[PDB]
Design a protein around this ligand. Structure first.
Ligand code: CHT
Ligand code: CHT
Ligand code: CHT
Ligand code: CHT
Ligand code: CHT
Ligand code: CHT
Ligand code: CHT
Ligand code: CHT
Ligand code: CHT
Ligand code: CHT
Lengths: 146, 146
C-alpha cells in the first residue's frame, strides 16, 4: 500500500504485487474488482477491449470492468455477470430487451425477425418488448404500431 | 418468470417467490443483486434509505443497491462493499479521500482536522488528499495552498 499496490507515473495507473510484479496485457482482480492492463502495464480506463475470448469488454474512467446495464456514449449495453458484452435477447425484470448483434447497443422502435425467420418482435422507443402490439393500416398500406 | 418473479402493477415493482411470497420492508438479493422493498411490497428506485443498522443506502432508478463510488445529484459518495454509505477517510487507488461525517458527500478544497485534533489534512478541488501541500503567506496573513 506504499511501494506495493496502485501506482501512478503520470501517463496512467499500474499495480505492484509483493512479487508477482505488475500485470500487463491481462485481466486482474483487485479488492474484488476486475481491471485490464495494456501491454505496457497501464490500466485501461474508459475504453472498449475485444478480448481473447471473442468478447467485448468495457472499462469506465475508473478502470472497473462493466457489469450489467451501462450507458456509454448515449447508448445502452448489457454486460453479463462476467463482463462480456451480450448481444441478442436479454431478460430484464418483467420484460425483454434486444441488443444489436453487430454493435451490441440496445435496439428500440424496431422490428426484430424471429429466430426461425418466420415472424417478428417489435421493441418500443424505450427498448422494451411489446407483449401486446397494436396495428393500424391505412389505404396506401402504411402501418402504425403501438 | 411469468406469474412468479418481477411484477409490475403500474405504481412500481414487486417480486413473487414460488412461495415465500413478496418481500416487504426488507432487503432482497435477486439474481446476484440487492434491492429493497417498501412496507407495501414496492421496490425502491432512485432513493435514499436509512436502515435499521444505522446505515444509509442508495438505490438507483433501476433499484440496484449502490456499491463503490456513485455520483448522486452531483455529489460523490463511497459505499462499502455491502452497500453502507461510508463517512470519514477512504482509500481509493493511490490516494485518500474524505467524506463528510454529516452528509457523507466527498469533501474538496478544504482543511480536515486530524483525529487527535492536532493537525490538518488538505483535500484539493478534485477531492484527493495533498501528500505534499505548499503554502504561501502574504503580509495580511492570507494563505494560499497547492
Ligand atoms: C512500470 N511502468 C508502468 C512504469 C512502465 C512500464 O514500461
Ligand atoms: C474521483 N473519484 C474517486 C470520485 C472517482 C473518479 O473516477
Ligand atoms: C434499458 N434499461 C433497462 C437499461 C434502463 C431503462 O431505464
Ligand atoms: C473472467 N473474466 C473474463 C472476468 C476475467 C478473467 O478472464
Ligand atoms: C422472448 N423472446 C421470444 C422475445 C426472446 C427469446 O428468443
Ligand atoms: C462493439 N463495439 C461497439 C464495442 C465496438 C465495435 O465493434
Ligand atoms: C405490490 N402489491 C401490489 C402486490 C401489493 C400492494 O398492496
Ligand atoms: C447485507 N446487506 C446490507 C447488503 C443487505 C442485507 O442487510
Ligand atoms: C491516513 N489518514 C491520516 C489520511 C487518515 C487514515 O485514518
Ligand atoms: C443524508 N444523506 C445526505 C445521505 C441523504 C440525503 O437526504
Amino acid at each position: 500500500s506504499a511501494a506495493t499496490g496502485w501506482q501512478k507515473n503520470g501517463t496512467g495507473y499500474w499495480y505492484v504485487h509483493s512479487d508477482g510484479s505488475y500485470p500487463k496485457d491481462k485481466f486482474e482482480k483487485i479488492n474484488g474488482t476486475w481491471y485490464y492492463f495494456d501491454g505496457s502495464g497501464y490500466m485501461l480506463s474508459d475504453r472498449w477491449k475485444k478480448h481473447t475470448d471473442g468478447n467485448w469488454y468495457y472499462f469506465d474512467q475508473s478502470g472497473e470492468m462493466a457489469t450489467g446495464w451501462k450507458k456509454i456514449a448515449d447508448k445502452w449495453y448489457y454486460f453479463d455477470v462476467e463482463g462480456a458484452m451480450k448481444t441478442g435477447w436479454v431478460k430484464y425484470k418483467d420484460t425483454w430487451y434486444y441488443l444489436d448483434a453487430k454493435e451490441g447497443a440496445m435496439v428500440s422502435n424496431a422490428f426484430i425477425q424471429s429466430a426461425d425467420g418466420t415472424g417478428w418482435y417489435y421493441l418500443k422507443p424505450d427498448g422494451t418488448l411489446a407483449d401486446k402490439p397494436e396495428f393500424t393500416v391505412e389505404p396506401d398500406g402504411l402501418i402504425t404500431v403501438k
